[PDB]
């Protein structure tokens, strides 16, 4: 049943590629130590074309131009929803693509419309899930969403608060502080969300 492991096979072969690239001697010494399992797997699972390419050894940005243009120049809710759905459906197949749409869909997270805002929040969360480094880049827009006048925006920012708090963890202090302040003066009750976020952060950092 190698077909259900297609993503795992791709990830493992990429890791092997990086292993032979950065440290060729250790990778070769491992491969010779386990040569026969690789040979038998290649003979049986010949459909692993990347594995056979390894034995032989022994683009992305252009596709997302019209999507980015449509997302940038779209005004009506229908166009924004359409382009966001097109990004969402294929991003499950290709999670790496969302790194290109970061700045473009940061402005969508502050959109007054509910559906596009929710979808943009989910896409941003998935993007920074794949790449935790870019999570700190989303701090100003997320803080703006928490402090904005549009109460729907503040609500959805609270909804996604534990996840992004788990993502950042260096500005989680100021982020949770902002959440508590908007809870204190704005009448919403973020005690549950702050509790879960703080629970995970404490269970990591000092427990």
């Amino acid at each position: 049943s190698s077909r259900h492991l297609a993503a795992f096979i791709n990830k493992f072969v990429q890791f092997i590629h990086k292993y032979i690239t950065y440290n060729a001697p250790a990778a070769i010494s491992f491969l010779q130590k386990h040569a026969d399992p690789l040979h038998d797997l290649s003979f049986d699972n010949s459909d692993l074309v990347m594995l056979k390419s390894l034995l032989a050894g022994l683009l992305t940005a252009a596709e997302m131009a019209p999507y980015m243009k449509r997302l940038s120049r779209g005004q009506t809710v229908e166009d924004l929803l359409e382009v966001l759905s097109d990004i969402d459906e294929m991003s499950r197949r290709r999670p790496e693509i969302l790194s290109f749409f970061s700045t473009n869909l940061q402005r969508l997270m502050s959109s007054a419309e509910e559906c596009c805002r929710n979808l943009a929040f989910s896409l941003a969360l998935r993007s920074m899930q794949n790449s935790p480094s870019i999570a700190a880049a989303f701090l100003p827009t997320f803080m703006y969403c928490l402090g904005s006048q549009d109460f729907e925006v503040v609500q959805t920012a609270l909804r996604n608060l534990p996840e992004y708090a788990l993502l950042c963890q260096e500005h989680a202090a100021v982020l949770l502080h902002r959440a508590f302040l908007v809870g204190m003066y704005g009448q919403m009750d973020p005690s549950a969300q702050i509790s879960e976020a703080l629970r995970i952060l404490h269970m990591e950092a000092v427990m």
Binding site: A62, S72, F100, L139, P140, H171
Partner: protein
């Protein structure tokens, strides 16, 4: 120049920095100058052509990450280098598909001390306006979002606010330049009045007074101010008025006074709100001193204690305190009252 345009992927910023440093053997210096000129022209050709498949320039894609450092180096004004760096900033901002120009504009406005650097920012906006649209709202939004977040520390915040105030005041001075530029700093600044109002309450005094000046000169939205916006602006204005009156005395009060006079002139509701809040804060238990208003136990006990209590007990909570005292110069009281009454008139 073709190779450096279409090949550099990771070391592009370091390579360009080295090449510009060489272009700061005299023949090698002029060769590098010609190299940078042809590089800028080639990038201009690449970004602006065929318009429709999109051109891809790896050199500019690499340099997109180093936009902040490029903006910082442009502000230092290294003789003729800042011309090349500024033109490259324009090219990069036009090239990027999410249109990263507002980020560069925000960095320039935040980091610009002197009016020459502000002139650099206006030149970049003038260069980009013919190609791109809606740069100022996005730039102001991003910069204010960075201000409200932990990033963009109070020095750069005060610098940004002072620069925006300078731009708004310059546009209000109806010369040939404001008309030619077509920037509309006033409208874009007015769009973010709800965002600028908290800065009047900032703990850092310099940020507070920069925001006070900006609020004093910035035009209100063409339609009107919302009741929440009007109430927030009036409360922040009166708080800044009293705080600056306490801190700097009467001289450091003009900005808040101008803001409150404008708010009163907006509408009768605004007038009533300004007057009511101002006098209430004047009569409040705090700020009333600005206008001449008025306002070990057991061990020591064992030390004092022959073997009889003598006194049957202590009436109430012992001795009364040392009583309240007050002292302030009457001249300062008179002129604070004069400032408040002049604002009210």
């Amino acid at each position: 120049v073709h190779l450096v345009s279409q090949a550099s992927g990771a070391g592009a910023y370091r390579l360009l920095q080295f090449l510009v440093d060489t272009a700061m053997p005299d023949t090698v210096r002029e060769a590098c100058d010609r190299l940078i000129q042809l590089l800028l022209l080639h990038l201009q050709k690449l970004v602006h052509h065929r318009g429709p498949p999109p051109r891809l320039v790896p050199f500019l894609d690499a340099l997109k990450n180093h936009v902040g450092e490029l903006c910082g180096e442009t502000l230092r004004l290294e003789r003729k280098r800042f011309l090349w760096q500024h033109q490259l900033l324009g090219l990069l901002s036009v090239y990027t598909r999410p249109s990263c120009g507002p980020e560069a504009l925000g960095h320039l406005l935040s980091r610009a001390r002197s009016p020459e650097e502000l002139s650099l920012a206006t030149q970049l906006y003038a260069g980009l306006v013919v190609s791109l649209s809606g740069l100022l709202p996005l730039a102001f939004r991003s910069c204010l979002a960075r201000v409200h977040a932990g990033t963009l520390q109070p020095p750069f915040t005060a610098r940004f606010l002072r620069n925006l105030a300078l731009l708004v005041g310059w546009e209000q001075q109806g010369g040939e330049g404001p008309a030619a530029l077509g920037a509309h700093f006033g409208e874009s600044a007015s769009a973010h009045l709800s965002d600028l109002a908290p800065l009047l309450l900032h703990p850092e005094e310099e940020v507070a007074e920069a925001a006070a000046s900006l609020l004093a000169i910035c035009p209100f939205p063409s339609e009107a101010l919302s009741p929440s916006q009007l109430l927030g602006l009036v409360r922040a204005g009166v708080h800044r008025f009293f705080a600056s009156l306490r801190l700097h005395g009467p001289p450091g009060v003009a900005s808040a006074c101008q803001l409150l006079t404008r708010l009163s002139q907006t509408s009768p509701a605004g007038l009533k709100a300004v007057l009511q809040l101002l006098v209430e804060g004047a009569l409040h238990r705090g700020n009333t001193e600005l206008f001449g208003g008025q306002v070990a136990s057991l061990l020591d006990t064992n030390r004092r204690h022959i073997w009889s209590v003598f006194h049957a007990g202590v009436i109430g909570r012992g001795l009364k305190p040392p009583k309240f005292v007050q002292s302030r110069n009457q001249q300062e009281v008179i002129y604070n009252t004069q400032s408040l009454l002049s604002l009210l008139v």
